[PDB]
Subunit: 196 residues, 4 copies
C-alpha cells in the first residue's frame, strides 16, 4: 500500500549536495504536492559527541540501515541519532531524499531506489568551503584551510571517492547545472509516476 | 520547427556507440511520428586517418558547422563523409550524436543534452579484448598494442578532461545507462510536442 | 648495527617485484659488503587467504612487529608464512620490502624511504594478461575476471589512496632506466650516510 | 659537460621556489660549474592574460632554446629579452621549471625529468596562503584566477603530461623533501661531471 522511494545523494565535503537537494525538493513540492517529500542529512546519524564529521568512523551505519528499512516498510515515525524524529505520513506515497558523504557504501546500495554522486574537484570544493566560511562568515582563513585539508581531505581520499562509481548517476558540478537538475527531476518524476 | 540534439560522448570501447544504436531503435519503435537520426563523429575523420582515436584526426570545425545548421533548423546537412542527410522541416527532430570529442568547449552550446558514458580504463580495455580478441579472434598482442599505444594517449590527453563538460555522467555497469537515457528522451519528446 | 628500510608499494601487476630485483642487483654490485635482501608482503598473508589483493587478508600487526625488529637490529625474524630471515649483525643492512599495502599511514614511520610504483589501470591489466594469458597460457576470461572483480576493488578502495604517502612516485613505462638510476643513487646516498 | 634538468608541476606547486633554492645551492656548492635557471614563463606570448594556458606559450621557441643549449651555442635570447651566455670552457647545469616541460616533443632534450605533484586542493591552499595571507591580495580575485584560468589549463594540458617524468615527487604544503631529493640528484650529476 504505502510506497516509498529513497534517493541517495552522496558527495565529498563542500560539494553543494545540500543546496542541490533543496532545489530538487522545490521541484517535488511543485510537481507532486500530494506525494510526501523530505530531505534527510546523513549527519543526523553521527555518533553523539563525534569530533570529526568527515570520517566514516564517526557514523552509526547500522542505525542508518534500520531507518532505511523502516522507510521502505512504510513506517510512520523514524527517530535519528540526532535526537530528531520525523513523521512519515501513511496516507501518501513518500519520496525521501538523503544527502551525505557515505551513502554509497556497498553495504547500503540495495536500500536505494536511486543513487546519485555529486562530483566536484577538490579545488572547487575548497573554493566553496573558503567562500562560505571565510568570505561570507568571516572565519579565519588558515583554520578553515586546515580543517579542509587535514580532516576532510583524508576522509574524502580514503573512504568517499572510491564509492563514487556505485552511483547510477554522477552529476558533475558547475556554475550552472540547470540541465542536470532537470534530468534528475524528470527522473524523480518518472519514479513517482511508476510509484503512483 | 524544433530540433533536439543529444551528445553522448565516451572513451574508446565505452559502449557509447551501441548505447546510441539502442536508443535509436527505441525511438524508431516508439516514436515513428518523430524524425530520429544518429550521427557518428567518425563521419568527420580526415581522409585515410590511420588513428581513429586521436583528436588531430577529426575535422572539428566541420562538425561545429553541422551542429550549428541543425540548431538553426537546416533541412539538408552534408558531411565530410561525402554523404548528405535531409532533415524534415514538417516534423520535430531528435538527433543522437556519438563520438569521442563531442564535449569540447566550443561545441557545448549546441546540445540539448550532454552525456558522458564513463568507465575506468581497465574496464574499457577488458571490453576491447573481449570484443576484438575473444569474439573477432584477433591477435591479442596487436589488439593490446592498438589500445595502449593509440587509444590510451588520445583518451588520457584529449577525451578524459572533457568529461566534466557533460550535464550527466553515466558510470557504466556491465543496461543502466540505456534505461536512463531512454527515459530522458521520452521527457524530451513530450516537452518538444 | 644500522638498518635502512625501503618500502616499495604499488598496485596489482605494477611490476614492483621486478623493479625491486633491479634495485637489488645494483645493491649487490655497488655495496657487496652491505647486507641487502628483498622481502615480500605476501609472506604476511593469513593462512589460506582466497583474495591475495584484499587488505583484510594481511596480518599488518605482524608486519609492524617485523619492521620494529629490523629497526632494533634483530638477527633472526620469522614471518607468518613460515620463512625465517637471517640478518647479519656484523654488517649494515638495507631491507627492500615489496607489496600492496606498505605505504599505509600506520606503517609510514618505520621506513627509511618510501616508493610507489605507479602505473595506470589499463597498462597494469595489459601486463596482467600478457603474463598470465600470452606467456602462461591461462584462460583469458578467467584472468580478466580475476583482475576486474578482485584486484580492481582492492586497488581502488585501499591501495590507490596510499600512493601519495611515498617519498618517490615512479611512473612505470617501457624504459625506466633514468628512474632506476635516480633510485639507486638515492639508496647509495642512504648507505653512505649509514657508514 | 652539459646537463638539463626539467622540473614541471601544476600551478602553485612550489616548483619555482624549489628550483630557485636548487640554483642558489648550485651557486654555493659548484661555483666553477655554470648554473642557470630558465623559467618557462619567459616564453609567454605577448599580453598573456592567462599565464597558465598552453596556448599562451611559445613552445616552438622553447624547443629551439633547448636545442641551442644541447648544441652548445654561446648566446640564446629568450622571448622576454633575457639572454644566456653558455661558456665554452665550462660544464653546465641548466635547471628548467615550468608547466609544459613534459610535452612529448620536448622529452628527449632533458638529462632528468621531474614532476612535483600536489593535489589541486593542496595547490589552491598554497595559492591562497601565499597570495592572500602573505601578499595581501583580494581573496575573490585570487580564487577566480585559480579556478577559471589555472584549473582548466592544468586539467586539460598539464596533468596528462605528468607521467612523462622520470620521477614524480609527491608533496604537501612545503617543498623541503623534494628539495633534498633533487639536491642530492644534482650532486650525483656533478660527481659524474668530474
Amino acid at each position: 500500500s504505502v510506497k516509498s522511494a529513497i534517493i541517495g545523494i552522496a558527495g565529498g565535503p563542500f560539494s553543494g549536495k545540500t543546496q542541490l537537494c533543496e532545489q530538487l525538493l522545490e521541484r517535488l513540492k511543485s510537481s507532486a504536492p500530494s506525494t510526501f517529500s523530505k530531505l534527510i542529512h546523513l549527519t543526523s546519524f553521527l555518533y553523539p559527541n563525534s569530533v570529526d564529521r568527515y570520517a566514516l568512523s564517526s557514523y552509526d551505519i547500522e542505525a542508518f540501515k534500520k531507518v532505511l528499512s523502516l522507510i521502505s516498510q512504510g513506517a510512520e515515525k523514524i527517530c535519528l541519532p540526532d535526537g530528531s524524529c520525523i513523521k512519515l505520513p501513511v496516507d501518501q506515497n513518500r519520496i525521501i531524499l538523503i544527502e551525505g558523504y557515505y551513502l554509497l557504501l556497498p553495504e547500503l546500495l540495495p536500500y536505494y531506489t536511486s543513487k546519485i554522486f555529486v562530483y566536484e574537484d577538490a579545488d572547487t570544493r575548497l573554493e566553496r568551503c573558503v567562500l562560505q566560511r571565510v568570505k561570507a562568515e568571516k572565519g579565519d582563513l588558515t583554520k578553515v584551510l586546515n580543517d579542509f585539508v587535514t580532516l576532510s581531505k583524508p576522509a574524502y581520499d580514503s573512504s568517499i571517492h572510491p564509492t563514487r562509481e556505485n552511483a547510477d548517476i554522477i552529476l558533475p558540478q558547475k556554475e550552472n547545472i540547470d540541465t542536470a537538475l532537470l534530468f534528475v527531476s524528470q527522473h524523480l518524476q518518472d519514479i513517482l509516476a511508476e510509484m503512483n
